[PDB]
Amino acid sequence: SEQSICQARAAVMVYDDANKKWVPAGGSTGFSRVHIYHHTGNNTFRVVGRKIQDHQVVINCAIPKGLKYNQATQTFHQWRDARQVYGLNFGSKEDANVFASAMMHALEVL
Ligand SMILES: CC(=O)N[C@@H](Cc1ccccc1Cl)C(=O)N1CCC[C@]12C=C[C@@H]1CC[C@@H](C(=O)N3CC[C@@H]4C=C[C@H]5C=C[C@@H](C(=O)O)N5C(=O)[C@H]43)N1C2=O
Ligand SMILES: [Br-]
Ligand SMILES: [Br-]
């Protein structure tokens, strides 16, 4: 089965490569509950975020082994895939540190 190993509150953003700016994931700005989930068997992790107001899934992306997770500032962290760059604007330094730590520890289990 699948298990949430950590969660944190963050405004989830994606980078608009064409206009050089960050835009809100899913179309509207606001905080989401962002989880890292582990699936047993094939030992995979994914980031899944749902907007707190309406449960819209704003991010659902795989965490591949060797993913480069960038702590750009104390409360904005980011990573990429082929299609998009994702950014989490955390509610506090503490939320960020919790999430970052779970991510770094996931990358060691992969
Ligand atoms: C090599 C590479 O991919 N580099 C990436 C970052 C990264 C490094 C390691 C691993 C993964 C990633 Cl995504 C990179 O530099 N990127 C990807 C998106 C666009 C950007 C490339 C150039 C620009 C320059 C400034 C920086 C950026 O986007 N920043 C810096 C921190 C700041 C913090 C928050 C967001 C929120 C709104 C916007 C703003 O402040 O107006 N922000 C920014 O402007 C953010 N940029 C980036 O982060
Ligand atoms: Br829970
Ligand atoms: Br496993």
Ligand 1 mutation pick, 68, 69, 85, 103, max ligand atoms within 8 A of CB: 85
Resolution (A): 1.7
Q: Is 109 buried (19+), middle (13-18) or exposed (0-12) by CB count in 10 A?
A: exposed
Separation between Cα atoms, residue 46 and residue 38, nearest integer Å: 7
**CATH number for 41:** 2.30.29.30
Residue 21, strand partner residues: 16
Q: Are the CB atoms for 53 and 30 separated by under 8 Å?
A: yes
78 forms beta bridges with 70, 87
Approach to solving = X-ray
Q: In the chain, how many domains are there?
A: 1
Ligand 1 binding pocket (C-beta < 6 A) is: 15, 22, 68, 70, 72-73, 76, 78-80, 85, 87, 89
Ligand nearest the Cα of residue 7 is: 2
Torsion of CA 4, 43, 105, 49, to 10 degrees: -40
In ligand 1, the atom with minimum distance to the C-alpha of 15 is 18
- Domain of 55 in residue numbering reads as 1-110
Q: Rounded to an integer, what distance in angstroms lies between the CA atom of residue 96 and that of residue 110? A: 21
Dist. CA 108 → ligand 3 center (Å): 13
